[PDB]
Amino acid sequence: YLTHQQKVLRLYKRALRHLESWCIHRDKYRYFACLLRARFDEHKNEKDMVKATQLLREAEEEFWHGQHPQPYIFPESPGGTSYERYECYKVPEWCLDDWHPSEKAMYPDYFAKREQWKKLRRESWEREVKQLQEETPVGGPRTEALPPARKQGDLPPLWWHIVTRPRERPM
Amino acid sequence: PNINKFFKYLLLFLITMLILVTANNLFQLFIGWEGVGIMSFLLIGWWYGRADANT
Amino acid sequence: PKYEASRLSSLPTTLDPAEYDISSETRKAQAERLAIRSRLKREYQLQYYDPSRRGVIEDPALVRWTYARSANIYPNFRPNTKTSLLGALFGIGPLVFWYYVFKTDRDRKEKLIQEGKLDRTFNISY
Amino acid sequence: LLDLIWLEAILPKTISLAQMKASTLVTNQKGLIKLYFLSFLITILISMILFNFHE
Amino acid sequence: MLKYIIPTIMLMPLTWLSKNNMIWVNSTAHSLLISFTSLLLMNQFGDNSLNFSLLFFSDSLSTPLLILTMWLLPLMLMASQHHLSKENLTRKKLFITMLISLQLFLIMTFTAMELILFYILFEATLVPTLIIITRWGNQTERLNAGLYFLFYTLAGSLPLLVALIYIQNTVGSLNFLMLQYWVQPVHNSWSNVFMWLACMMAFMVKMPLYGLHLWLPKAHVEAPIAGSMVLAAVLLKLGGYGMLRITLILNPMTDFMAYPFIMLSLWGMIMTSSICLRQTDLKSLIAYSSVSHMALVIVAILIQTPWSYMGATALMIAHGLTSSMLFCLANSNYERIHSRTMILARGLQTLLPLMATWWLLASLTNLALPPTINLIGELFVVMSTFSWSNITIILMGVNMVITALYSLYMLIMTQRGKYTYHINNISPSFTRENALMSLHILPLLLLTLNPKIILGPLY
Amino acid sequence: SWDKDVYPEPPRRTPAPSPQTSLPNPITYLTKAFDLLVDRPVTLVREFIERQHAKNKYYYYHREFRRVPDITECQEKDVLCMFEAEMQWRRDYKVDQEIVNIIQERLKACQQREGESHRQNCAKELEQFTQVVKAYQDRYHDLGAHYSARKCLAKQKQRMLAERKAAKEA
Amino acid sequence: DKRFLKLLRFYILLTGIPVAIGITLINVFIGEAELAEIPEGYVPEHWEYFKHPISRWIARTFF
Amino acid sequence: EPYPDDGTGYGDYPKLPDRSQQERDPWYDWDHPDLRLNWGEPMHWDLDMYIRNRVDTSPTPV
Amino acid sequence: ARQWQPDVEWAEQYGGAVMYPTKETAHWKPPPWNDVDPP
Amino acid sequence: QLLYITSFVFVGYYLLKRQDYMYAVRDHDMFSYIKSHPEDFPEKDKKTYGEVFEEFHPVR
Amino acid sequence: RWQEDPEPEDENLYEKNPDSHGYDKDPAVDIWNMRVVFFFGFSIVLVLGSTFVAYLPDYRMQEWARREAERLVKYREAHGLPIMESNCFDPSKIQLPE
Amino acid sequence: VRDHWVHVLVPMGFVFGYYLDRKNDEKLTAFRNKSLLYKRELKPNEEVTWK
Numbered sequence A: 001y002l003t004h005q006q007k008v009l010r011l012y013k014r015a016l017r018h019l020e021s022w023c024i025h026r027d028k029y030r031y032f033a034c035l036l037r038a039r040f041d042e043h044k045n046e047k048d049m050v051k052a053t054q055l056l057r058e059a060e061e062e063f064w065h066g067q068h069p070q071p072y073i074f075p076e077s078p079g080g081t082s083y084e085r086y087e088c089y090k091v092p093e094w095c096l097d098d099w100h101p102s103e104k105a106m107y108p109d110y111f112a113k114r115e116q117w118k119k120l121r122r123e124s125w126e127r128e129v130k131q132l133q134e135e136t137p138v139g140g141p142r143t144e145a146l147p148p149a150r151k152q153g154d155l156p157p158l159w160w161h162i163v164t165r166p167r168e169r170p171m
Numbered sequence B: 001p002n003i004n005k006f007f008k009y010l011l012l013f014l015i016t017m018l019i020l021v022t023a024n025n026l027f028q029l030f031i032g033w034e035g036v037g038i039m040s041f042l043l044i045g046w047w048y049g050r051a052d053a054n055t
Numbered sequence C: 001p002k003y004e005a006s007r008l009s010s011l012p013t014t015l016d017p018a019e020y021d022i023s024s025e026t027r028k029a030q031a032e033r034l035a036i037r038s039r040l041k042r043e044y045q046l047q048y049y050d051p052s053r054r055g056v057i058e059d060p061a062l063v064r065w066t067y068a069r070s071a072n073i074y075p076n077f078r079p080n081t082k083t084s085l086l087g088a089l090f091g092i093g094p095l096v097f098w099y100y101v102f103k104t105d106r107d108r109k110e111k112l113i114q115e116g117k118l119d120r121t122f123n124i125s126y
Numbered sequence D: 001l002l003d004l005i006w007l008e009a010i011l012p013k014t015i016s017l018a019q020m021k022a023s024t025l026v027t028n029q030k031g032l033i034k035l036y037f038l039s040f041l042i043t044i045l046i047s048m049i050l051f052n053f054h055e
Numbered sequence E: 001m002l003k004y005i006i007p008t009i010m011l012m013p014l015t016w017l018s019k020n021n022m023i024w025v026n027s028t029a030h031s032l033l034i035s036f037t038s039l040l041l042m043n044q045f046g047d048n049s050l051n052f053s054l055l056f057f058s059d060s061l062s063t064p065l066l067i068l069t070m071w072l073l074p075l076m077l078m079a080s081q082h083h084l085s086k087e088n089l090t091r092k093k094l095f096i097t098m099l100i101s102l103q104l105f106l107i108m109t110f111t112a113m114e115l116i117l118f119y120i121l122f123e124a125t126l127v128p129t130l131i132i133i134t135r136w137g138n139q140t141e142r143l144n145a146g147l148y149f150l151f152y153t154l155a156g157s158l159p160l161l162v163a164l165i166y167i168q169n170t171v172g173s174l175n176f177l178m179l180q181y182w183v184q185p186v187h188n189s190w191s192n193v194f195m196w197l198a199c200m201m202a203f204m205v206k207m208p209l210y211g212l213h214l215w216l217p218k219a220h221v222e223a224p225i226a227g228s229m230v231l232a233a234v235l236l237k238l239g240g241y242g243m244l245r246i247t248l249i250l251n252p253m254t255d256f257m258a259y260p261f262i263m264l265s266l267w268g269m270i271m272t273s274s275i276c277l278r279q280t281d282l283k284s285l286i287a288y289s290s291v292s293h294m295a296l297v298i299v300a301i302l303i304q305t306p307w308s309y310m311g312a313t314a315l316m317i318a319h320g321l322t323s324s325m326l327f328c329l330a331n332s333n334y335e336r337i338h339s340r341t342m343i344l345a346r347g348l349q350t351l352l353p354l355m356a357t358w359w360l361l362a363s364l365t366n367l368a369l370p371p372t373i374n375l376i377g378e379l380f381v382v383m384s385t386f387s388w389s390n391i392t393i394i395l396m397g398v399n400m401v402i403t404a405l406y407s408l409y410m411l412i413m414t415q416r417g418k419y420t421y422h423i424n425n426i427s428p429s430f431t432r433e434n435a436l437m438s439l440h441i442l443p444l445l446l447l448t449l450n451p452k453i454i455l456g457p458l459y
Numbered sequence F: 001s002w003d004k005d006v007y008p009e010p011p012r013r014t015p016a017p018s019p020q021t022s023l024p025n026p027i028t029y030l031t032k033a034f035d036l037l038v039d040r041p042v043t044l045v046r047e048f049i050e051r052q053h054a055k056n057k058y059y060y061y062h063r064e065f066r067r068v069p070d071i072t073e074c075q076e077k078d079v080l081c082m083f084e085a086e087m088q089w090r091r092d093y094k095v096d097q098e099i100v101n102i103i104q105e106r107l108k109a110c111q112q113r114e115g116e117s118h119r120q121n122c123a124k125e126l127e128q129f130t131q132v133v134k135a136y137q138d139r140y141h142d143l144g145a146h147y148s149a150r151k152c153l154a155k156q157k158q159r160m161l162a163e164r165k166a167a168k169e170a
Numbered sequence G: 001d002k003r004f005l006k007l008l009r010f011y012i013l014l015t016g017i018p019v020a021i022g023i024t025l026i027n028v029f030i031g032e033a034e035l036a037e038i039p040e041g042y043v044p045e046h047w048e049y050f051k052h053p054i055s056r057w058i059a060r061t062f063f
Numbered sequence H: 001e002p003y004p005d006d007g008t009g010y011g012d013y014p015k016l017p018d019r020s021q022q023e024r025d026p027w028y029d030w031d032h033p034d035l036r037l038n039w040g041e042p043m044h045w046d047l048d049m050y051i052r053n054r055v056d057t058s059p060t061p062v
Numbered sequence I: 001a002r003q004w005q006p007d008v009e010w011a012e013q014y015g016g017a018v019m020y021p022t023k024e025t026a027h028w029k030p031p032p033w034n035d036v037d038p039p
Numbered sequence J: 001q002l003l004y005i006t007s008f009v010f011v012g013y014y015l016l017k018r019q020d021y022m023y024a025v026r027d028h029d030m031f032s033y034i035k036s037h038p039e040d041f042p043e044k045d046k047k048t049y050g051e052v053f054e055e056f057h058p059v060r
Numbered sequence K: 001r002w003q004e005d006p007e008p009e010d011e012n013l014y015e016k017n018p019d020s021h022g023y024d025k026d027p028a029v030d031i032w033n034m035r036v037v038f039f040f041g042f043s044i045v046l047v048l049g050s051t052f053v054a055y056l057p058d059y060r061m062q063e064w065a066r067r068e069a070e071r072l073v074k075y076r077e078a079h080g081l082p083i084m085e086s087n088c089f090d091p092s093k094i095q096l097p098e
Numbered sequence L: 001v002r003d004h005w006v007h008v009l010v011p012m013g014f015v016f017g018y019y020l021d022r023k024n025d026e027k028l029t030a031f032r033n034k035s036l037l038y039k040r041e042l043k044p045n046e047e048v049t050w051k
């Protein structure tokens, strides 16, 4: 499902990250990052696709042999040490509807503004559904892409759970 | 946000270990023995939204 | 040294020979797979984003799974050579194995007690 | 294998099957006076020749 | 026992003559009062049991079982009144009448002096229980659950009736005090082997013994919450109470007749513990957890040692509160998401903080964290089975590992991780639900301060 | 408070302070502070409580059980006699459990008191524990959960039969 | 959740405080019984074989 | 593709690849991010064994 | 979900001539509602 | 409702009278037969448990 | 197909009564149900019940047995008797077979 | 009170059951002050040892 170009660029990024895991020191990594870029550059203009696929196929085998068994992972990336760390603090917005009236009374201005967002969501829903109906082929949607708002005064269909989603550091 | 619960758990961790260390009979020792084990479960899995922490 | 896949260590996608043989038939299949996913994603999203919905969006896929893992098993069970041997070996076998382990151990212990050769000097809790 | 299949099969499922088959044998009668009274003749004959209920 | 039987009976006119909107208030208030008076049964003596009359007696075994029984009725009423809200008045009063009648049969069952009187009340409990399951369960499978429950019980219980009537002919009495003195040894013969089986199989089915347990996961998954609570908390213990009494007259034949059932139980507890690790229905997981716990009780009763009988008593009481609490916890989720699938609603600790604390405490008692009476009971059985044979420690120890894994797997799956995005009706825990959980866990943990009252006669 | 004969304690030998340093002993001052800040106030509260108790003196008693004929004197199936013999046996069983518990407490106290010399210095207590555990095991071990005077008597008669047989052939 | 815990605390203390006070006053101003030999020709009541006043009350009243 | 028609009780339930949920793309916008499942997709028979807390089948460097 | 109660498909299980259909009783029909057969 | 109670009680009383009479007759017949045939109902010689041998079955 | 009522919508008790204790729709009945459960459940049964259990008059004779054991140990040791004997019953009262 | 008379039903039932339980004791006095363990001479004012 990834094109040839996408596969080659993903291999380049992945190989540089494992290379940086081996080198550690910045000056050393710069030296070998340039040598590695030269190898990708040596075949940049290959035109016979059969030949290029063989090059990519072999490069992936070379990457597998030489990968770091413990590559650096950004802390919040999947598999990182802080991945999903703050999920226990992410509370969905609908929980606020169940607050006791004395709890809402502590934030009169926040809850007035929240009531306006719910009004906006309600007034916009039927137009959002209608736009999706009239823009979707007869069989159904063939990709997961969603359209923008067309008319002025409309909102992009299916926006609520993207716009009102929890903050990355909710506390 | 749950720093108070964190300190309560650390103190409970400490108490169960002292139960373990001063126990004069094997049943009292087992109380501390399993106490520290369960307190580790709750503190290792402190960030319970992270699957790796629960694992 | 080529990758040797196992049950618990799959073959990496980048080393899959078929990941590069993407023909017009395979690309057609991928498009059809994405079409189903997009169709289901839209059905879910129209309920998920509905401002007037309070409750649980029932998932037939989840219902089918829990049903398949229980209610549907006996109706599709056939007693044949395979299920009989596994039934006998796994259900009856362990019970016989443990009976002899405990019966043998207890017969030996009883014989020692009856001859005063088992040390029970301070044994008064049972 | 055990709980959902064999432990069901060897007791409740087999016992229920036998009763259902027996019921059909008993109740699948033609409603014919001739056949019922014929079985009476066999019953009386067997009662004497085979079991000696008349002694 | 008339001071308990009669007020229990009076709960029926109380419920039927109450104002329409006060049936739950009145029945709950007065069943709690009856439970309070049940503590008067703690007048136990070191040598003699408390022998009220020619019909009823109470000793250290039946007393904790009585107090658990009378404690559960108010808890069941609290647990039931929400899902019964839309039911019409007469059908609510009928539901409460079945619960009261079950309590009446149970307190008479646990105190009956004569084994045939015990049998009749032991069997009367089927009727209200069956009615509760099949009339007020939610799903189509409740009708089949009622049938499995009914005929598994009667398959073993009718042979028990023949054996008991035979014993009275031979001995002259089924009075338990009489049998303590007129008991004679059981000799080896095929006649006595089947006498032994008729005397024990009815109780094995109710425990339930591994291999005769298939009815139980059906009955729970289909019963309403109050049916699940009394089924798990008390009705299983009829079997344990039955064996603890009837084994008096089966010696020394139990020396070898126990072997097949100890093997089924020792292996069964590992099989049913492993099963819990792959269950998809939360109610079915808790049901299979009961099978594993009661396997220890069967082993404890069968090896017949003072330590095993004390552990069996403590285990039965402790499992009663823990298991009933777990069903109540699972039901509280069910009242919001209307599904028993464990994986459906996750990360609930984020949404219901205090309820997650009840989940943690119920889990820790289920895996027998010391010094809970759950651990005390299990440990006493472990100590006594080791003397029976040292190798049992391998099986008992492995089962302890598996019990922790599924107890905490259930906790982690439903309480931790990320909440399900589309489940947006998780309203805050009601005061009623929180009070229901505390009335399980608080007495359970308070018993750790004075375990002797739940250790039985062998104490 | 308790009978010293039942719960013996050897006479206590404390060495006298024999310092060989010029530094003050921090424990001595702490000991004095404890007696002033903790012991004296605590003693006053107790003395007040003892005054109130002295005003309202009343007594309780240790129940005494007359002996009744034991199971050996009971005719077969005579529940009225078996019941009293059985109840007496059950009371004696509970008492013997506590006798063993007293001896075990003596043994445990000796082990702690004697420190590193406990192996040599607790021989008398270990002997008495060994003998009482043997007697208790002979009476009560292996009876089962459904124990009784009848089963205990059957166990004894089996033991007497074996001891007679060994004695005769010897 | 906070309301429940406040209610749970209130109702436990509603009787828990009077009981804790009541026990303390009984232990101070009544005190336990002192063990004594049975005077010759005396038959104690069954509740006189117990030491603590609350235990004696329980035995006398209910048992 | 259904499971082989022995007498084991699979019925027509699909046989899906025996892969842990850890192997799925963590950057895709899953309906159930913790499980890496989409609503309405067929669940593996052993899904509960393949959650990210249990059996991992991910490729290994060795 | 509200408590399941029998539907028409469940009810018709009990509206036949026999509870357990067989090859022999396939031709059986329920008798007249008022027990009267036409002349 | 009053006549329902009265009718049951009225019949129940006479049924209870006949019930007790039949059981009194059963006992009367039994004791008279035991007297008529003393040879079949001798007084068993009773031994105390000190004399009666019972095998002991340890639970270990 | 047939004429059947639709499944009713799930009703949130907090909607109409934000102070609901979850016992009843009627706020007055709701409060009374809460009070009886809490007063009888916690104030009475658990507190007084726990107190009652705490002061049971020597449950099952354990304290009497310890006092009696002390008396026998004292007497037997002073008079030079064994603390315990192997024979529960006097042999002179037993007749052995054979 | 016509509004709160149902609250006597269970308490009265306990009192009645208590009374009936005591009544049963009076039918089981065959061995009162006659057991070998507890038999004793009566106190000057005592009519029975227990009831």
Ligand SMILES: CCCCCCCCCCCCO[C@@H]1O[C@H](CO)[C@@H](O[C@H]2O[C@H](CO)[C@@H](O)[C@H](O)[C@H]2O)[C@H](O)[C@H]1O
Pocket (backbone or CB within 6 Å): C074, C075, D011, D012, D013, D015, D016, E144, E147, E148, E151, E152, E153, E155, E156, E212
């Ligand atoms: C071990 C001692 C106790 C053994 C007791 C065994 C006797 C039978 C107990 C259960 C009887 C229940 O009565 C009947 O049982 C069968 C299965 O058993 C159920 O039938 C069930 O299995 C059959 C066959 O798989 C299916 O066709 C049916 O759809 C399903 O509901 C009936 O719906 C139920 O009406």
Ligand SMILES: CCCCCCCCCCCCO[C@@H]1O[C@H](CO)[C@@H](O[C@H]2O[C@H](CO)[C@@H](O)[C@H](O)[C@H]2O)[C@H](O)[C@H]1O
Pocket (backbone or CB within 6 Å): D013, D015, D016, D017, D019, D020, E151, E155
């Ligand atoms: C230990 C001795 C215990 C003796 C207990 C006796 C219990 C007898 C229970 C009733 C027996 C008949 O019960 C009947 O069983 C059969 C199959 O089992 C069920 O029949 C159902 O399953 C069978 C088997 O697949 C199908 O062929 C049938 O189409 C289906 O309806 C009936 O729905 C049920 O009504």
Ligand SMILES: CCCCCCCCCCCCO[C@@H]1O[C@H](CO)[C@@H](O[C@H]2O[C@H](CO)[C@@H](O)[C@H](O)[C@H]2O)[C@H](O)[C@H]1O
Pocket (backbone or CB within 6 Å): E016, E017, E018, E019, E020, J001, J002, J005
């Ligand atoms: C000679 C023997 C005869 C024995 C008869 C003994 C009982 C006689 C009872 C007569 C009174 C019956 O009372 C009649 O029924 C019920 C119960 O009170 C009342 O109405 C009832 O409504 C609801 C229940 O539905 C409750 O609040 C309460 O039970 C009552 O108010 C009627 O308004 C009254 O007319």
Ligand SMILES: CCCCCCCCCCCCO[C@@H]1O[C@H](CO)[C@@H](O[C@H]2O[C@H](CO)[C@@H](O)[C@H](O)[C@H]2O)[C@H](O)[C@H]1O
Pocket (backbone or CB within 6 Å): E036, E037, E038, E039, E040, G045, G060, G061, G062, K048, K049, K052
């Ligand atoms: C856990 C708490 C349970 C709460 C139970 C609530 C119901 C309480 C029922 C109370 C019943 C009291 O019943 C009655 O009490 C009085 C005390 O005044 C007793 O009075 C008698 O007690 C003893 C009897 O040996 C003697 O001292 C003397 O004969 C007399 O004082 C009666 O023998 C008893 O019939």
Ligand SMILES: CCCCCCCCCCCCO[C@@H]1O[C@H](CO)[C@@H](O[C@H]2O[C@H](CO)[C@@H](O)[C@H](O)[C@H]2O)[C@H](O)[C@H]1O
Pocket (backbone or CB within 6 Å): E188, E189, E190, E193, E257, E260
């Ligand atoms: C879950 C299923 C549980 C199944 C449990 C099966 C237990 C099997 C117990 C076997 C012991 C049965 O009881 C045993 O039977 C044999 C006959 O065969 C009896 O044998 C009796 O008759 C034979 C004649 O052949 C005589 O030689 C012998 O002297 C006499 O004892 C024994 O008196 C008895 O010891």
Ligand SMILES: CCCCCCCCCCCCO[C@@H]1O[C@H](CO)[C@@H](O[C@H]2O[C@H](CO)[C@@H](O)[C@H](O)[C@H]2O)[C@H](O)[C@H]1O
Pocket (backbone or CB within 6 Å): F056, F057, F058, F059, G018, G019, G020, G021, G022, G023, G026, G030, G052, G053, G054, G056, G057
């Ligand atoms: C915390 C509240 C708990 C509520 C339940 C307990 C309520 C009652 C508890 C205390 C009762 C008063 O205590 C009770 O009175 C006196 C002591 O004064 C004792 O009685 C004894 O002393 C009094 C003199 O004072 C004399 O009559 C006599 O010497 C003797 O009978 C009782 O044996 C004791 O039990």
